[PDB]
Amino acid sequence: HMCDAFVGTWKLVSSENFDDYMKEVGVGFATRKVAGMAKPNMIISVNGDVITIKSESTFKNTEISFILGQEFDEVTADDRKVKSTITLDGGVLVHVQKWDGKSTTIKRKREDDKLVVECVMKGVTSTRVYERA
Numbered sequence: 001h002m003c004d005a006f007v008g009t010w011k012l013v014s015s016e017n018f019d020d021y022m023k024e025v026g027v028g029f030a031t032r033k034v035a036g037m038a039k040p041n042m043i044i045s046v047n048g049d050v051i052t053i054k055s056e057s058t059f060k061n062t063e064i065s066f067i068l069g070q071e072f073d074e075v076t077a078d079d080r081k082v083k084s085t086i087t088l089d090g091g092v093l094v095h096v097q098k099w100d101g102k103s104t105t106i107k108r109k110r111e112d113d114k115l116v117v118e119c120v121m122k123g124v125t126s127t128r129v130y131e132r133a
């Protein structure tokens with residue numbers, strides 16, 4: 001019953017400060033513009049210990065499967081090759097990506113009927129809010 005409250009199909013309804021977060025990460029102009037337009041569908045499922053997050057959009061489709069606490073290699077939508085670790089901390093999924101001596105953290109939280117995603121790179125935060133599809 002791990003991650004029960006995250007499981008489902010979610011749709012992005014708002015994004016704040018995402019272009020600035022992507023600049024802080026190092027994403028180039030053309031990818032920022034096309035990526036920032038996307039309104040993805042995030043599909044979260046659990047099978048035993050394995051959590052899968054599948055995200056579908058006009059920009060990119062991605063899929064990650066993982067076990068909490070167990071590092072995995074991820075190719076992000078902006079083509080970074082990162083080493084990722086996802087843990088549960090006080091009911092928040094905390095996803096750390098490491099590449100080229102850099103780090104970014106993505107937190108996914110259940111708040112009311114929404115799933116709230118906070119992406120942090122150094123001092124820059126972006127918030128992306130999802131509703132049930």
Ligand SMILES: O=C(O)[C@H]1CCCc2ccc(-c3ccc(Cl)cc3)cc21
Pocket residue numbers: 021022025027035036038040055056057059060061062076077078
């Ligand atoms: O979330 C995902 O799985 C993907 C697929 C669905 C759409 C989308 C949009 C933008 C970015 C994205 C872009 C730039 C940066 Cl730095 C990080 C993430 C990542 C994604």
